[PDB]
Design a protein around this ligand. Sequence first.
Ligand SMILES: *[C@@]12=NC3=[C]C([C])=C([C])[C]=C3N([C][C]([O])[C]([O])[C]([O])[C]OP([O])([O])=O)C1=NC(=O)[N]C2=O
Ligand SMILES: *[C@@]12=NC3=[C]C([C])=C([C])[C]=C3N([C][C]([O])[C]([O])[C]([O])[C]OP([O])([O])=O)C1=NC(=O)[N]C2=O
Lengths: 128, 135
Amino acid sequence: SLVKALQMAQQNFVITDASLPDNPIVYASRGFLTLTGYSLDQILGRNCRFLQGPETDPRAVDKIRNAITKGVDTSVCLLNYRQDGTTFWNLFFVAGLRDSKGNIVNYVGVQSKVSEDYAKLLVNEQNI
Amino acid sequence: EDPDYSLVKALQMAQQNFVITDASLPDNPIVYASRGFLTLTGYSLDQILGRNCRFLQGPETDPRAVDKIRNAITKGVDTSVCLLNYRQDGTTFWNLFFVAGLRDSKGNIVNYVGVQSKVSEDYAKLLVNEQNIEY
Ligand SMILES: *[C@@]12=NC3=[C]C([C])=C([C])[C]=C3N([C][C]([O])[C]([O])[C]([O])[C]OP([O])([O])=O)C1=NC(=O)[N]C2=O
Ligand SMILES: *[C@@]12=NC3=[C]C([C])=C([C])[C]=C3N([C][C]([O])[C]([O])[C]([O])[C]OP([O])([O])=O)C1=NC(=O)[N]C2=O
């Protein structure tokens, strides 16, 4: 009763269109704007990867990239950057929205800023 | 290990037929719609976005069923309703849709997610008899 219990804050979510080449962001909640610091215009049309930066863990990025292309739902905690250049730890959950026949045309992303000590716990788990 | 998200679950059981409304905006207008909702209703994105979902309703739509959602919506309680909707061409179908409010850190509903589905005639009769029980 933790990983899901805390993460439950859902006002931070995006929707992406997989039918467009780089699975770009087609919708972002105002909460996502608040969290990331970006305007709607500087988000829409872009792959969510733009939040990442120098100190972002590449091996973590690889894990979700694979999860997404394989269509499996997963969550991941990695280092993200705001509009201004500050960094927060992002625990986000990505889930593919399958049509009646099982094809993914949209994806849901739910983002969460997590504390330092919780991030350390989540990252170490990923290091296995 | 993995979350039981109100939003994620509502969406996964949606069958690519859903919308997102913005509660902060006047009259809780649709700010996103899946292609599934597009084909179902016959409207284009330009004919949908910025509008309240009530535009799918018409002369025969049960005003009682409508009252049910309106109430559940103002009280921020998740519910599903089966009412008669009208496509852009004016043909009718029975819509069984589910709506769930999304709250911010302060508990305020800032977004709604709706999940619509066309139901067969025989199935509708069932859902409606059940619906009528509370009266
Ligand atoms: C971003 N959230 C997010 C939400 C959705 C629904 C999807 C599909 C992806 C993300 N990403 C992951 C990112 O876009 C990309 O998939 C990964 O970087 C791996 O692919 P690449 O090609 O870059 O190796 C999110 N990434 C973030 O860093 N933060 C989020 O909140
Ligand atoms: C519409 N789906 C739908 C989805 C969401 C997310 C929300 C918030 C509402 C709907 N409506 C209900 C409608 O917009 C309105 O809230 C009710 O009619 C009651 O309000 P009013 O002020 O009009 O009495 C949906 N209505 C439909 O008829 N069909 C759906 O698919």
